[PDB]
C-alpha cells in the first residue's frame, strides 16, 4: 500500500500558519494543566502515537490516515493519559473542518516543541482520513520495561537507527509518567515544559537506584525526585548509545537538530510526497508574530 500527500483543497502556508496558531493561542489558554505543566508534552506524546503505529513492512499503521479517530486505537492501553489531548484538539479542529486529522494530530506536536522553545521542525500537509478498517491494531507501541536491545529492534520497524533513537528519546525532558496511566511515577526532570537536552544531563550526571514503586513496576530514581523508564536507563547501559546521549548532553544545538530531523521523519513515515507537492513548512511561534 501506497498513501500519496494531498494537499487539502486550496489551503497553503498561511491556513496551516493560523491552525498552528490555534493551537498555541489554547496552549495558552489551558496553560494551567497538570499544575502547570501544560498541555505541551501531551500533544507531543500524541503526535509520536499516532505516528508509532507505523510498520515499515506493509505500510499498515502511521500518521497518514488519522486512525486515532476510532475508538480501537484511541482506547489502545498504550494510549492511557493522551484522552485531554485528543480532546484538546477536537475543538480546533471543528475551527478548520478543512484539516485531516492526521495533518492536525501531528500539527499539534511540532505547534508545542516550538511553542516550548524547541527547535524549529519543518512541517508537511496533504495526510488523509482512511476509514475505520484501516485502523492498526494494538500492541504497536514500544514497552517501557524493556533494554537496550528490545529499544533498538523495536525502532528499526519505525526505520529509526541510533542516533535517531536517542534523539527522539530527547522528548522526555517534557513531562511526566502518571502511576494511573503507565504505572510509572515522576519526572525525568525540573524544567518540564521546557524543550531542552535536559534527559540526557540527568541520565548522565544523577545517581540512579533501581526501586519498585506503587505499581509493582521497576523503575530508576533518584533522590532529587527524577526517574528514567528501564528503556531511558538502557541508553547509557548500551555502549553505543552511551556514546550518543553524552554527545546531546554536551550540546544541545546538535540535539535540536538531529530531534528535529527525527521527529519530522516520524511524523512523515509511510507517506509518499508527490514531486510537485509542497516544500515543507516551517511556521513562526506566536513570540516571533509578536502574538
Ligand atoms: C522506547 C520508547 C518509548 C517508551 C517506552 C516511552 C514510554 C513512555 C512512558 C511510559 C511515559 C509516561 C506516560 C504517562 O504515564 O502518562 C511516556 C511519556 C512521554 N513520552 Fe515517551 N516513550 C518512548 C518514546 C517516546 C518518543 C520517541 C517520544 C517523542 C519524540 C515520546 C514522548 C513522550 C512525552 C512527551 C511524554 C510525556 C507526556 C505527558 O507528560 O503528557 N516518548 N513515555
Given at each position: 500500500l501506497v498513501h500519496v500527500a494531498s494537499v487539502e483543497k486550496g489551503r497553503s502556508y498561511e491556513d496551516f500558519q493560523k491552525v498552528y496558531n490555534a493551537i498555541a493561542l489554547k496552549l495558552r489558554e489551558d496553560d494551567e494543566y497538570e499544575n502547570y505543566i501544560g498541555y505541551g508534552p501531551e500533544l507531543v506524546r500524541l503526535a509520536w502515537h499516532i505516528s508509532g503505529?507505523?510498520?515499515?513492512?506493509?505500510?499498515?499503521?502511521?500518521?497518514?490516515?488519522?486512525?486515532?479517530?476510532?475508538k480501537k486505537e484511541f482506547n489502545?492501553?498504550?494510549?492511557?493519559?493522551?484522552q485531554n489531548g485528543f480532546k484538546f484538539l477536537e475543538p480546533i479542529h471543528k475551527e478548520?473542518?478543512?484539516?485531516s486529522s492526521g495533518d492536525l494530530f501531528s500539527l499539534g506536536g511540532v505547534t508545542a516543541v516550538q511553542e516550548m522553545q524547541g527547535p524549529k521542525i519543518p512541517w508537511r500537509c496533504g495526510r488523509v482520513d482512511t476509514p475505520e478498517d484501516t485502523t492498526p491494531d494494538n500492541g504497536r507501541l514500544p514497552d517501557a520495561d524493556k533494554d537496550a536491545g528490545y529499544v533498538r529492534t523495536f525502532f528499526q520497524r519505525l526505520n529509526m537507527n541510533d542516533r535517531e533513537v536517542v534523539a527522539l528519546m530527547?522528548?522526555?525532558?517534557l513531562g511526566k509518567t502518571e502511576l494511573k496511566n503507565s504505572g510509572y511515577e515522576g519526572?525525568?526532570?525540573?524544567?518540564?515544559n521546557v524543550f531542552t537536552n535536559e534527559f540526557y544531563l540527568n541520565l548522565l550526571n544523577e545517581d540512579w537506584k533501581l526501586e519498585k514503586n506503587d505499581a509493582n513496576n521497576e523503575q530508576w530514581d533518584s533522590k532529587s525526585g527524577y526517574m528514567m523508564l528501564p528503556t531511558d536507563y538502557s541508553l547509557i547501559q548500551d555502549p553505543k548509545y552511551l556514546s550518543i546521549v553524552k554527545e546531546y548532553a554536551n550540546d544541545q544545538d546538535k540535539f535540536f537538530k538531529d530531534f528535529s530531523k527525527a521527529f519530522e521523519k516520524l511524523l512523515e513515515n509511510g507517506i509518499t510526497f508527490p514531486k510537485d507537492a509542497p516544500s515543507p513548512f516551517i511556521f513562526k511561534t506566536l513570540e516571533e508574530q509578536g502574538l
Amino acid at each position: 500500500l501506497v498513501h500519496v500527500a494531498s494537499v487539502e483543497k486550496g489551503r497553503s502556508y498561511e491556513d496551516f500558519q493560523k491552525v498552528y496558531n490555534a493551537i498555541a493561542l489554547k496552549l495558552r489558554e489551558d496553560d494551567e494543566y497538570e499544575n502547570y505543566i501544560g498541555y505541551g508534552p501531551e500533544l507531543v506524546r500524541l503526535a509520536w502515537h499516532i505516528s508509532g503505529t507505523w510498520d515499515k513492512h506493509d505500510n499498515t499503521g502511521g500518521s497518514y490516515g488519522g486512525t486515532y479517530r476510532f475508538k480501537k486505537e484511541f482506547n489502545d492501553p498504550s494510549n492511557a493519559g493522551l484522552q485531554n489531548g485528543f480532546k484538546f484538539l477536537e475543538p480546533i479542529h471543528k475551527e478548520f473542518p478543512w484539516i485531516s486529522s492526521g495533518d492536525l494530530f501531528s500539527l499539534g506536536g511540532v505547534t508545542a516543541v516550538q511553542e516550548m522553545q524547541g527547535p524549529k521542525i519543518p512541517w508537511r500537509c496533504g495526510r488523509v482520513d482512511t476509514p475505520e478498517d484501516t485502523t492498526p491494531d494494538n500492541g504497536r507501541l514500544p514497552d517501557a520495561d524493556k533494554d537496550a536491545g528490545y529499544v533498538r529492534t523495536f525502532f528499526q520497524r519505525l526505520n529509526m537507527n541510533d542516533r535517531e533513537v536517542v534523539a527522539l528519546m530527547g522528548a522526555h525532558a517534557l513531562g511526566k509518567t502518571e502511576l494511573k496511566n503507565s504505572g510509572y511515577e515522576g519526572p525525568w526532570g525540573a524544567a518540564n515544559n521546557v524543550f531542552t537536552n535536559e534527559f540526557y544531563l540527568n541520565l548522565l550526571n544523577e545517581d540512579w537506584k533501581l526501586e519498585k514503586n506503587d505499581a509493582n513496576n521497576e523503575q530508576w530514581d533518584s533522590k532529587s525526585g527524577y526517574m528514567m523508564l528501564p528503556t531511558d536507563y538502557s541508553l547509557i547501559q548500551d555502549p553505543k548509545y552511551l556514546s550518543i546521549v553524552k554527545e546531546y548532553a554536551n550540546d544541545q544545538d546538535k540535539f535540536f537538530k538531529d530531534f528535529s530531523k527525527a521527529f519530522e521523519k516520524l511524523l512523515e513515515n509511510g507517506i509518499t510526497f508527490p514531486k510537485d507537492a509542497p516544500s515543507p513548512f516551517i511556521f513562526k511561534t506566536l513570540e516571533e508574530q509578536g502574538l
